[PDB]
Design an enzyme around this catalytic site. Sequence first.
Site, PDB file in Angstrom:
ATOM      1  N   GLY A  60       2.333   6.043  10.077  1.00 13.85           N
ATOM      2  CA  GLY A  60       3.736   5.970   9.682  1.00 13.85           C
ATOM      3  C   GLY A  60       4.443   4.714  10.162  1.00 13.85           C
TER       4      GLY A  60
ATOM      5  N   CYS B 232       3.553   1.658   9.471  1.00  8.34           N
ATOM      6  CA  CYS B 232       3.482   0.541   8.516  1.00  8.34           C
ATOM      7  C   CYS B 232       4.851   0.106   8.032  1.00  8.34           C
ATOM      8  CB  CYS B 232       2.536   0.853   7.369  1.00  8.34           C
ATOM      9  SG  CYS B 232       0.926   1.469   7.914  1.00  8.34           S
TER      10      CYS B 232
ATOM     11  N   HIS C  51       0.801  -1.227   0.000  1.00  5.89           N
ATOM     12  CA  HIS C  51       0.000   0.000   0.000  1.00  5.89           C
ATOM     13  C   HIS C  51       0.840   1.286   0.000  1.00  5.89           C
ATOM     14  CE1 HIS C  51       0.220   1.200   4.250  1.00  5.89           C
ATOM     15  NE2 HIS C  51      -0.034  -0.052   4.617  1.00  5.89           N
TER      16      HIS C  51
HETATM   17  C1  LIG Z   1      -7.340   3.908   6.065  1.00  3.80           C
HETATM   18  N1  LIG Z   1      -5.966   3.538   6.375  1.00  3.80           N
HETATM   19  C2  LIG Z   1      -5.223   4.527   7.149  1.00  3.80           C
HETATM   20  C3  LIG Z   1      -3.746   4.443   6.780  1.00  3.80           C
HETATM   21  C4  LIG Z   1      -3.226   2.998   6.952  1.00  3.80           C
HETATM   22  C5  LIG Z   1      -3.206   2.596   8.428  1.00  3.80           C
HETATM   23  O1  LIG Z   1      -4.042   1.837   8.917  1.00  3.80           O
HETATM   24  N2  LIG Z   1      -2.205   3.147   9.136  1.00  3.80           N
HETATM   25  C6  LIG Z   1      -1.921   2.950  10.491  1.00  3.80           C
HETATM   26  C7  LIG Z   1      -1.260   1.826  10.982  1.00  3.80           C
HETATM   27  N3  LIG Z   1      -1.061   1.565  12.282  1.00  3.80           N
HETATM   28  C8  LIG Z   1      -1.527   2.441  13.161  1.00  3.80           C
HETATM   29  C9  LIG Z   1      -2.218   3.628  12.817  1.00  3.80           C
HETATM   30  C10 LIG Z   1      -2.711   4.547  13.777  1.00  3.80           C
HETATM   31  C11 LIG Z   1      -3.361   5.682  13.381  1.00  3.80           C
HETATM   32  C12 LIG Z   1      -3.558   5.953  12.031  1.00  3.80           C
HETATM   33  C13 LIG Z   1      -3.095   5.093  11.075  1.00  3.80           C
HETATM   34  C14 LIG Z   1      -2.415   3.899  11.435  1.00  3.80           C
HETATM   35  C15 LIG Z   1      -4.104   2.017   6.203  1.00  3.80           C
HETATM   36  C16 LIG Z   1      -3.566   0.818   5.744  1.00  3.80           C
HETATM   37  C17 LIG Z   1      -4.379  -0.103   5.123  1.00  3.80           C
HETATM   38 CL1  LIG Z   1      -3.687  -1.608   4.580  1.00  3.80          CL
HETATM   39  C18 LIG Z   1      -5.727   0.133   4.931  1.00  3.80           C
HETATM   40  C19 LIG Z   1      -6.270   1.335   5.354  1.00  3.80           C
HETATM   41  C20 LIG Z   1      -5.464   2.284   5.986  1.00  3.80           C
END
Ligand SMILES: CN1CC[C@@H](C(=O)Nc2cncc3ccccc23)c2cc(Cl)ccc21
EC number: 3.4.19.12
Lengths: 305, 306
Positions: B143, B145, B41
């Site tokens: 950030g 990821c 992603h």
């Molecule tokens: C909608 N979205 C947000 C960005 C990213 C995501 O989950 N990022 C984040 C990861 N770990 C903690 C977080 C804590 C607060 C914010 C983001 C966080 C992500 C990734 C996938 Cl595969 C699908 C959707 C998505």
Amino acid sequence: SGFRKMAFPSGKVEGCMVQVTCGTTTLNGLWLDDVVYCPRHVICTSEDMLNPNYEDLLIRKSNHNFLVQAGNVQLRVIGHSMQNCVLKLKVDTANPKTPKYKFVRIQPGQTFSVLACYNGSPSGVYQCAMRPNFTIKGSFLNGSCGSVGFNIDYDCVSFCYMHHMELPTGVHAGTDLEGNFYGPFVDRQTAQAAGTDTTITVNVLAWLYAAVINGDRWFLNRFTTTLNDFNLVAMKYNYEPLTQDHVDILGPLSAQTGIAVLDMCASLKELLQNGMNGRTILGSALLEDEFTPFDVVRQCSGVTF
Amino acid sequence: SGFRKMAFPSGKVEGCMVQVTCGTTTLNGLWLDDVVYCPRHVICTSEDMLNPNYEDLLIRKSNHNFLVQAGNVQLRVIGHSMQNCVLKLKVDTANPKTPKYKFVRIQPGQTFSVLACYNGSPSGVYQCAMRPNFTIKGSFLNGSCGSVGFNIDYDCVSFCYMHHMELPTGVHAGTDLEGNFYGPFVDRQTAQAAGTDTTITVNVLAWLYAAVINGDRWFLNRFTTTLNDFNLVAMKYNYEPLTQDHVDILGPLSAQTGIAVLDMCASLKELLQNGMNGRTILGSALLEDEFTPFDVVRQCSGVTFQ
Ligand SMILES: CN1CC[C@@H](C(=O)Nc2cncc3ccccc23)c2cc(Cl)ccc21
Ligand SMILES: CN1CC[C@@H](C(=O)Nc2cncc3ccccc23)c2cc(Cl)ccc21
Ligand SMILES: [Cl-]
Ligand SMILES: [Cl-]
Ligand SMILES: [Cl-]
């Protein structure tokens, strides 16, 4: 989201861990520049520990009596001296992995990461707090002596603890890197006990702010308290006094969550008098006191090293 | 003595963390030999996330669209390919800090250390367990990821997790290092939710054995139970079923303490019925389920404190 007991990345310290052997005793040493630091009790036999005269035991040792192994490489000891309860072995090679470092003595309530080692090899890393009774509730087995505690501020490793012993209650005692013990402990096999411990109040408040930041608010209430009334309540439950310095240190977390420090104190006061009523805060049924206000800000802001 | 939630020393993994940028998106990558692994992603905008066609998005990228920074050094990307939900960027330099490593896919209940990173820089290390619902209860911000989970038994790093996303309940989802998600999750912003979580029973039993090894016996009782009766009770408290494999795995801890597995199961049933009544077990007022039987044997001494 999420809140974990998080240690600093240990790599900068792992590159300093060595094995120190003197006779039959083997423990860990910290190799920084051309010096290896380790507990002075490495020179003692089990009988010597009953009543050791460390200067006398040390005068009988030569440099070749200390075997220092860094990985699968033997370092040559070219000098030895004692500073308080730490033995300093001068070696002929400066550690090429020496990070930017400093030796700092911490206060009770301060947290640090422990890199537990056996035979000069790192086994695990965990986050500890220096208890108000100067012990640490660590996880250490025989051979763990010389394992160190540290923090990182920017790219500088501040070494604050070196492991020396386990007390009868299973808690641990050690020194700063200048060999001064934390607490009223001595490096001798004699009757020693941890004093009655207290809870680190400022750290509990910091952890309550972390819970609020993570969406747990059930414990919040409409009340506030004076610092003097809170401290009368704190003394009753073996909580450390909260000072105006602690209130100031909690200022940023107070501004971020909109909950004044004395407003959070009223939540804590109610939690002490009534309990949690079957509820949990950040997955805990006890009030956690091993996160400082700085730890909470760092984890909730994503500070890197 | 003592029993702590302990992570593996993170140094071997810290020397593999890099920053990966594709357009406006920046996340972490794992640099092993001449390959940088990261969540696919990284090629998406926030808009692309609802129904991304990763094959279509990737075919539009060239090697120079990926900026990989290792410390203050830019690595040159010389190839790119996708394997499931992981993007693999071939680089022109093998990482001189590459440890002895392997990729392992873990099962629910397994534990691992997480080295949380932002912009290719390590921020902290903590211990996690793969929940029965295939989520992990991590501590991750935007950030994070590309941050990885691992175990280091011997001098070999077994990479088992790569962080991809946070679900609406604040729990986390990711993949193994071959890009296969743990659980029924997808790398899309579509409505997804963690299934009901349960307690890892075998791990709670392992932790009760750790408490006995460390001298605490208050929770023991004169009773035993059948495996089936234990499961009928335990499932009423949202505990995972205990299998004969779990009973076998607990054999060594049972032999070391002298407490048969089904006898420890009877203690667990009583704890679920009574609570702790103001007492603690290893400094905890709740039953801990993020220590496996293997973790307990590794942390604890071979001699029980009788
Ligand atoms: C909608 N979205 C947000 C960005 C990213 C995501 O989950 N990022 C984040 C990861 N770990 C903690 C977080 C804590 C607060 C914010 C983001 C966080 C992500 C990734 C996938 Cl595969 C699908 C959707 C998505
Ligand atoms: C009698 N004795 C034992 C060896 C050493 C000691 O406490 N070592 C240990 C350290 N940390 C955990 C342990 C867990 C089980 C066993 C030893 C452990 C020591 C050190 C001093 Cl300064 C005084 C006495 C003493
Ligand atoms: Cl309480
Ligand atoms: Cl602050
Ligand atoms: Cl597994």
